[PDB]
Design a binder for this molecule. Structure first.
Ligand SMILES: N[C@H]1CO[C@H](OP(=O)(O)OP(=O)(O)OC[C@H]2O[C@@H](n3ccc(=O)[nH]c3=O)[C@H](O)[C@@H]2O)[C@H](O)[C@H]1O
Ligand SMILES: Cc1ccc(/N=C/[C@@H]2CNC3=NC(N)=NC(=O)C3N2C=O)cc1
Length: 302
């Protein structure tokens, strides 16, 4: 079976890895260029393809006609997206007779959209999953071919959850790809009244507002802990990042209760800044972070 593939990130790499094991011919892979703001810790889909002799591109707009045209000539039987970031129109999606699929890290139709890895940790979800589905004009909405559910633990952060999502993702593809290759899918439409959609995330989305409950602020620390861009606050004009934290069950919110442990009063309870860095400084424990910041007992953040 012949395939053209749209992939990036660790999921991109495992997807391609799974396609090749299961015995497909990946005729070409589309991907993206890396960006300076996003710590690139993950597998490179472009290195993967080169490694295996597959043609690889990263056009900013795959939906431009010339690209539609090169894709149509490759005669993809099936189309696979694994963690690609832009929409692929119905023109490219129609070109595959056996159809097109996407692999997505959520219990669809919950957490459609972007960065569900991170969104579920922000919202303090106790479980999540991986879904493989028909890829249609409308984002993350086509019929579900398979789904594997996995539990989020309280001590989990973005990096630990991501490796569980990838582990789950590879299994899903072992449990799915032969069936797709042979012509044997139970696809079920997604239930629209259950659906949720969460949008694009930026570093600025992890600003810490200390009027919130601590466990809310703690779940933001967890959702973008390193290698994500880190939840942050300010001391004066000084930005500083909270890399890891701990909820500790009469100081007003955003006030430094103690500086060792470095403990900030929130709206409800208190959050311990276990580790953090000031501006572009090195990472340190919280007691040291205070000293560098000039924080004292009773200091006010924004
Ligand atoms: N099917 C979806 C599955 O999740 C992917 O998320 P993504 O890989 O993070 O990619 P993206 O949404 O584009 O977001 C990444 C950008 O967003 C930044 N980001 C991501 C999460 C977050 O919590 N904060 C943040 O700033 C990253 O640093 C980077 O700049 C894709 O959204 C879809 O493929
Ligand atoms: C705002 C936004 C923008 C893009 C997006 N997902 C893009 C990604 C990549 N390309 C896709 N192509 C198609 N035709 N359908 C999909 O569901 C797609 N996606 C599914 O993960 C999700 C939300």
């Amino acid at each position: 079976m012949k395939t053209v593939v749209f992939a990036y990130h660790d999921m991109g790499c495992l997807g391609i890895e799974a396609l090749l094991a299961a015995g497909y011919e990946i005729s070409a892979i589309f991907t993206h260029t890396d960006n300076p703001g996003e710590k690139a810790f993950y597998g490179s889909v472009a290195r993967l393809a080169a490694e295996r002799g597959i043609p690889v591109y990263a056009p900013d707009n795959v939906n431009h006609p010339l690209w539609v045209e090169r894709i149509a000539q490759l005669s993809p039987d099936v189309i696979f997206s694994f963690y690609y970031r832009h929409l692929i129109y119905d023109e490219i999606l129609q070109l595959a007779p056996a159809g097109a699929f996407n692999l997505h890290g959520s219990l669809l139709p919950k957490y459609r959209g972007r960065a569900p890895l991170n969104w579920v940790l922000v919202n303090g979800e106790t479980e999540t999953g991986v879904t493989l589905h028909r890829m249609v004009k409308r984002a993350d909405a086509g019929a579900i071919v398979a789904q594997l559910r996995i539990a989020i633990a309280p001590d989990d952060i973005a990096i630990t959850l991501h490796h569980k999502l990838c582990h789950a993702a590879r299994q899903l593809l072992e449990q799915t790809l032969p069936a797709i290759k042979h012509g044997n899918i139970l696809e079920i439409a997604q239930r629209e009244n259950e659906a949720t959609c969460f949008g694009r995330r930026t570093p600025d989305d992890s600003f810490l507002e200390w009027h919130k409950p601590a466990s809310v602020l703690h779940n933001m620390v967890r959702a973008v802990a390193d290698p994500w861009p880190g939840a942050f606050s300010y001391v004066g004009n000084q930005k500083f990042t909270v890399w890891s934290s701990r909820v500790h069950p009469k100081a007003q919110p955003g006030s430094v209760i103690s500086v060792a442990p470095l403990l900030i009063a929130c709206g409800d309870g208190a959050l311990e800044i276990v580790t953090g860095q000031a501006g572009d400084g090195i990472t340190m424990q919280g007691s040291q972070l205070a000293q560098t910041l000039g924080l004292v007992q009773g200091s006010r953040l924004n």
